[PDB]
Amino acid sequence: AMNILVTGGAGFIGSNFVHYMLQSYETYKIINFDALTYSGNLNNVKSIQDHPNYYFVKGEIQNGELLEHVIKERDVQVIVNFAAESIPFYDTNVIGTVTLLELVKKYPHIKLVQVSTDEVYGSLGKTGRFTEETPLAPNSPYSSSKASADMIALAYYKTYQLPVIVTRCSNNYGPYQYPEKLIPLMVTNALEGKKLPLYGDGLNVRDWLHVTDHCSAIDVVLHKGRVGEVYNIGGNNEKTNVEVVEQIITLLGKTKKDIEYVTDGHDRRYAINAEKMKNEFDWEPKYTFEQGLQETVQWYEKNEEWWKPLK
Amino acid sequence: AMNILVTGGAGFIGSNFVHYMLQSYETYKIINFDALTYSGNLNNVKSIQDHPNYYFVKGEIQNGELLEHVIKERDVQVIVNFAAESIPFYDTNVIGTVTLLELVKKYPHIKLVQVSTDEVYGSLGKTGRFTEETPLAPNSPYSSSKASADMIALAYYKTYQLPVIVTRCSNNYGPYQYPEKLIPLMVTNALEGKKLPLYGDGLNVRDWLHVTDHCSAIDVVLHKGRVGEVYNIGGNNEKTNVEVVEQIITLLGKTKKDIEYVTGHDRRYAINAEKMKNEFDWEPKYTFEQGLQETVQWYEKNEEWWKPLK
Ligand SMILES: NC(=O)c1ccc[n+]([C@@H]2O[C@H](COP(=O)([O-])OP(=O)(O)OC[C@H]3O[C@@H](n4cnc5c(N)ncnc54)[C@H](O)[C@@H]3O)[C@@H](O)[C@H]2O)c1
Ligand SMILES: NC(=O)c1ccc[n+]([C@@H]2O[C@H](COP(=O)([O-])OP(=O)(O)OC[C@H]3O[C@@H](n4cnc5c(N)ncnc54)[C@H](O)[C@@H]3O)[C@@H](O)[C@H]2O)c1
Ligand SMILES: OC[C@H]1O[C@@](CO)(O[C@H]2O[C@H](CO)[C@@H](O)[C@H](O)[C@H]2O)[C@@H](O)[C@@H]1O
Ligand code: NI
């Protein structure tokens, strides 16, 4: 029944989302629109590349002509914007978003889900959790670029009533995450017999959300989410980086002697309260961290062909 | 002693600032860097265009190569960024700011004062005033572009300790404001024997700051302002649009019979500037009654300036 444009769909979360939608909705058309930057990888999507309902488009979200063309042609009804970079950093994160908003402004029947991050709220103290009313206070170029796109997106809603929704999630983990990222780094280093580094003092705290739970959250927001709102999405947990490493160590029968301390800045604590998702759609994460972590570790053990070339 | 780059210096506030600094500091060099868009007007600065300490540069703040060149060459020490637009809207307001931050990152001795607006906080209810801890909640494309540049600017401070300061002020009024803007529109229409329009129901509330008080605030921040901080700047008043028109009407001996109703905009803006007060003992020197009167006179005396723009 629906046609969905997934920008950044060759990336980590994006690819996972593309798979999730195709498996969950046998009649939806999924258009993966991706610029294939360093973090974009077509291998993430090679299993469904010949699926009759999948379409790939190589391009930048800043390319309005191409976007219009794809939109008219595929009769697009929803746009989920995962496309982002981690100077043309702002071009993609801010200006790319603006380009999408202008398209929606011209085709106001098209719903836009701007996928954002909890880093937008800055760091928490020892206690407390972010809510959708927590004020924005980004500390990095990346998080500031992300917050900027959010505020701009919501201003388009308040100014022209465009069907725009913003989601803010905690740290994702799962299959297809590049090996530079914490969990894969720890796992793949362990598999390669290397030291497991901990930046800082290892006590930074994060809320770990399994990628597919993020995908199911977006699926809900996309379908039943109220236009103009923000929705925090989290894994209902909170872990120090060192706890995460210790769990990975145990899962691979390694010892703590493999850990090593290094220096770096990074925010001290992130933790998301997702009661709004819960109250409004009765949504909760399906995975516990213990369960997610284990499957993820296995995935990396079983997929050296995928991560070796990226390391 | 100092060399200051004023971006957007051919505009309303920018030009006023250029004049204010040249008159206040006989040994400072002021470099007006402006792209001369629709709202840029070299007549705003023609009286000081031959001043030995003034320099003009035509260019966009997105032009990093040009900026670097000007910086190296004029041995710039401070940058005050007034440049802004009211799609390449974001290019100038966000990306232009990023371009300036990158340059500061490369020349971290250069202080940057990012000039922002109270529209960044969104609208207030019936009571209360904005503080520097009021959360951001912009409602328009313009205010969202402005807030974006602020958050980005402060993130550069938190991430690399760059000497960046953000100021947020209320509605400016005064000499060299285009005749499309409320006060000039009312005044210039009255002078031309036209109806004085009130958009909406005339009850939108604003805090009116005289442009030279804004300039003096920036002068203080520039010199004594703490890096990484935000400073709210306001006129310590609050007026409905209709009150403003009534005052203009009495100042020109017109009657209310000249007002006319027409028809989105935020409901109420009001700034609390106690931080400026506590930290630098700064207050606006103008009262609205005083500022409004001088402004009205200015428009009466400068038809040569506003006629071509109307
Ligand atoms: N830990 C996390 O991964 C996390 C946390 C919170 C929020 N999210 C957010 O979700 C989104 C997806 O994150 P991710 O981890 O999949 O990152 P990723 O780096 O894997 O995804 C980026 C994808 O977008 C593509 N891309 C980059 N610039 C583009 C452009 N201008 N036009 C079109 N495509 C472009 C890349 O080629 C790649 O395919 C981001 O907006 C991110 O901020 C992620
Ligand atoms: N009531 C107000 O006017 C008010 C209130 C609060 C904050 N401010 C802020 O103060 C600043 C100046 O306001 P104003 O009303 O005096 O401005 P204005 O529109 O009169 O002046 C804008 C100036 O900037 C220049 N400019 C535009 N794009 C440029 C670019 N890419 N590169 C270089 N220069 C460029 C224009 O040529 C023009 O001379 C803005 O940043 C605005 O956001 C204004
Ligand atoms: O390296 C150029 C650099 O400057 C900018 C500023 O707008 O553009 C300049 O250079 C353009 C092409 O190189 C010219 O079209 C233009 O004259 C000039 O503004 C940036 O866009 C770019 O990063
Ligand atoms: Ni086509």
Side-chain angles (χ1 to χ4, degrees):
Chain A
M2 208 156 236
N3 289 57
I4 306 180
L5 180 81
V6 182
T7 66
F12 166 43
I13 307 185
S15 68
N16 275 288
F17 187 75
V18 171
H19 291 281
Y20 177 103
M21 300 296 288
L22 289 166
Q23 298 164 28
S24 301
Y25 303 82
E26 299 187 354
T27 63
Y28 284 21
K29 302 294 195 179
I30 307 296
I31 299 80
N32 180 9
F33 186 103
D34 197 292
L36 301 179
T37 61
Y38 170 73
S39 59
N41 186 351
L42 290 179
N43 292 303
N44 296 6
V45 164
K46 71 185 183 181
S47 63
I48 57 78
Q49 77 176 0
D50 289 327
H51 190 290
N53 294 346
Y54 169 87
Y55 301 82
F56 177 71
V57 181
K58 185 191 184 309
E60 292 183 343
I61 57 172
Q62 297 88 315
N63 190 341
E65 285 180 5
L66 178 58
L67 282 167
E68 256 200 284
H69 178 79
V70 173
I71 281 182
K72 286 178 172 292
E73 193 178 48
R74 290 279 152 256
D75 191 353
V76 175
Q77 297 156 45
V78 175
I79 292 169
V80 184
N81 186 33
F82 294 107
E85 260 294 310
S86 302
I87 327 169
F89 189 66
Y90 292 104
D91 192 43
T92 301
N93 298 350
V94 181
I95 291 194
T97 293
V98 172
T99 301
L100 291 171
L101 291 162
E102 288 295 315
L103 282 168
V104 166
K105 190 186 171 186
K106 181 164 173 184
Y107 301 100
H109 64 272
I110 299 175
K111 192 182 295 190
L112 173 67
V113 181
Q114 171 65 19
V115 180
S116 192
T117 174
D118 62 355
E119 294 192 38
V120 154
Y121 301 121
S123 180
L124 285 155
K126 258 52 186 172
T127 78
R129 291 177 299 163
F130 305 135
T131 72
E132 293 79 358
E133 298 74 42
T134 300
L136 305 203
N139 298 320
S140 65
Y142 174 77
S143 61
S144 61
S145 69
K146 275 277 148 180
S148 297
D150 290 359
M151 275 177 174
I152 290 171
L154 298 170
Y156 272 67
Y157 163 74
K158 296 172 198 171
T159 296
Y160 317 107
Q161 294 75 215
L162 302 193
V164 182
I165 298 174
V166 172
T167 73
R168 295 201 271 252
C169 70
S170 56
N171 303 47
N172 287 37
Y173 68 96
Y176 300 110
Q177 187 174 49
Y178 271 39
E180 313 156 8
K181 302 291 172 293
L182 189 73
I183 291 178
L185 182 61
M186 289 322 113
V187 176
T188 55
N189 278 339
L191 294 173
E192 291 179 327
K194 299 181 187 176
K195 303 279 72 179
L196 306 201
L198 277 173
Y199 67 82
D201 62 7
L203 296 159
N204 284 350
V205 175
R206 266 41 175 183
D207 172 327
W208 294 90
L209 173 68
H210 190 267
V211 193
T212 82
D213 280 324
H214 189 211
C215 293
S216 73
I218 289 165
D219 181 27
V220 175
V221 165
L222 179 165
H223 284 100
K224 303 166 183 289
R226 290 183 298 113
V227 161
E229 297 289 314
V230 169
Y231 293 100
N232 283 358
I233 303 171
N236 294 355
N237 69 66
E238 179 178 318
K239 306 288 176 182
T240 65
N241 290 342
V242 67
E243 291 180 52
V244 171
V245 192
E246 290 171 329
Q247 299 190 213
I248 292 170
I249 285 179
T250 290
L251 281 163
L252 298 165
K254 296 281 176 176
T255 68
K256 303 185 203 275
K257 290 167 182 182
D258 294 323
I259 302 166
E260 173 171 299
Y261 286 98
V262 188
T263 57
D264 60 326
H266 283 289
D267 291 359
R268 196 49 162 172
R269 191 170 91 96
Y270 300 146
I272 281 179
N273 175 335
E275 288 180 357
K276 180 169 177 174
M277 287 281 297
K278 173 65 189 177
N279 301 339
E280 197 158 321
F281 316 116
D282 195 26
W283 181 96
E284 285 175 314
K286 175 161 193 167
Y287 280 89
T288 63
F289 182 69
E290 172 180 15
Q291 185 205 338
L293 183 56
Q294 168 166 290
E295 291 184 8
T296 300
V297 169
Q298 289 165 5
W299 190 87
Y300 285 88
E301 288 177 310
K302 288 157 185 161
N303 293 283
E304 297 196 338
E305 291 190 5
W306 186 86
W307 60 262
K308 269 280 160 51
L310 308 173
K311 195 177 183 190
Chain B
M2 209 156 235
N3 289 57
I4 305 180
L5 182 80
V6 183
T7 67
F12 165 44
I13 307 185
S15 67
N16 274 291
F17 188 72
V18 171
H19 290 280
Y20 177 103
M21 299 298 287
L22 290 165
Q23 299 165 26
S24 300
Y25 302 97
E26 299 186 354
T27 62
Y28 283 23
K29 303 293 195 179
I30 307 295
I31 299 80
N32 181 8
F33 186 104
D34 197 291
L36 300 180
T37 60
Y38 171 73
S39 59
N41 185 352
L42 290 178
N43 292 305
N44 298 2
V45 165
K46 72 184 183 181
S47 62
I48 58 77
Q49 75 176 0
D50 288 328
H51 191 290
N53 294 346
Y54 168 87
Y55 301 81
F56 179 69
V57 178
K58 185 191 185 309
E60 291 185 339
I61 57 172
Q62 297 88 310
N63 191 338
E65 289 164 4
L66 178 58
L67 281 168
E68 192 170 346
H69 176 78
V70 173
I71 282 182
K72 285 178 172 292
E73 193 177 48
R74 291 279 153 255
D75 193 352
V76 176
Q77 296 152 281
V78 175
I79 291 169
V80 185
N81 186 33
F82 295 104
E85 290 189 349
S86 303
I87 328 169
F89 188 67
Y90 292 104
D91 192 44
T92 301
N93 299 349
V94 182
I95 291 194
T97 294
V98 172
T99 302
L100 293 172
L101 292 162
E102 287 295 316
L103 188 68
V104 166
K105 190 185 172 186
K106 181 164 173 184
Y107 300 100
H109 64 271
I110 299 176
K111 192 181 296 189
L112 173 66
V113 181
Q114 171 63 19
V115 180
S116 191
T117 174
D118 63 356
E119 294 192 38
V120 153
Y121 301 122
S123 179
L124 285 155
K126 257 53 186 172
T127 78
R129 291 177 298 162
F130 305 134
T131 72
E132 294 81 342
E133 298 74 41
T134 301
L136 305 203
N139 297 325
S140 65
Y142 175 77
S143 61
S144 61
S145 69
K146 275 277 147 180
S148 296
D150 290 359
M151 274 175 343
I152 289 172
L154 298 170
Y156 272 66
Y157 164 74
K158 295 174 198 171
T159 295
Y160 316 107
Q161 292 75 36
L162 301 192
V164 182
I165 299 174
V166 172
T167 73
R168 295 202 271 251
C169 69
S170 55
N171 302 50
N172 287 39
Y173 66 97
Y176 301 111
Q177 187 173 49
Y178 273 39
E180 313 157 7
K181 302 291 173 293
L182 189 72
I183 289 179
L185 181 62
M186 289 321 113
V187 175
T188 55
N189 276 344
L191 293 173
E192 291 179 325
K194 298 180 188 175
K195 303 279 72 179
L196 305 202
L198 277 173
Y199 69 94
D201 62 9
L203 173 148
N204 282 351
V205 174
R206 265 42 174 182
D207 172 324
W208 294 90
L209 175 66
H210 191 267
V211 63
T212 83
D213 280 325
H214 189 211
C215 291
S216 73
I218 289 166
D219 182 26
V220 175
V221 165
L222 178 164
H223 284 101
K224 304 165 183 288
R226 290 183 298 114
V227 312
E229 299 290 313
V230 168
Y231 292 100
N232 284 355
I233 303 171
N236 295 350
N237 68 67
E238 180 177 320
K239 306 288 176 181
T240 65
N241 289 346
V242 66
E243 291 180 51
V244 171
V245 193
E246 289 171 327
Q247 298 191 215
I248 292 170
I249 285 179
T250 66
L251 283 163
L252 298 165
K254 296 282 176 176
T255 176
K256 302 186 203 275
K257 227 182 181 183
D258 295 322
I259 302 166
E260 173 170 299
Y261 277 78
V262 189
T263 56
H265 283 288
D266 290 358
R267 196 49 161 172
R268 192 170 91 97
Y269 300 146
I271 281 179
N272 175 336
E274 289 180 356
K275 180 169 177 174
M276 286 281 298
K277 174 65 189 177
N278 300 340
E279 197 159 322
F280 316 118
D281 194 27
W282 180 97
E283 285 176 313
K285 292 141 200 165
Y286 279 90
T287 62
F288 181 70
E289 292 67 43
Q290 182 67 33
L292 183 56
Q293 167 168 293
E294 293 183 9
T295 299
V296 170
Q297 289 164 9
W298 190 88
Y299 285 91
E300 289 178 309
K301 288 158 185 161
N302 291 282
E303 296 196 338
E304 291 187 5
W305 187 85
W306 60 262
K307 269 281 160 51
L309 307 173
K310 198 179 184 190

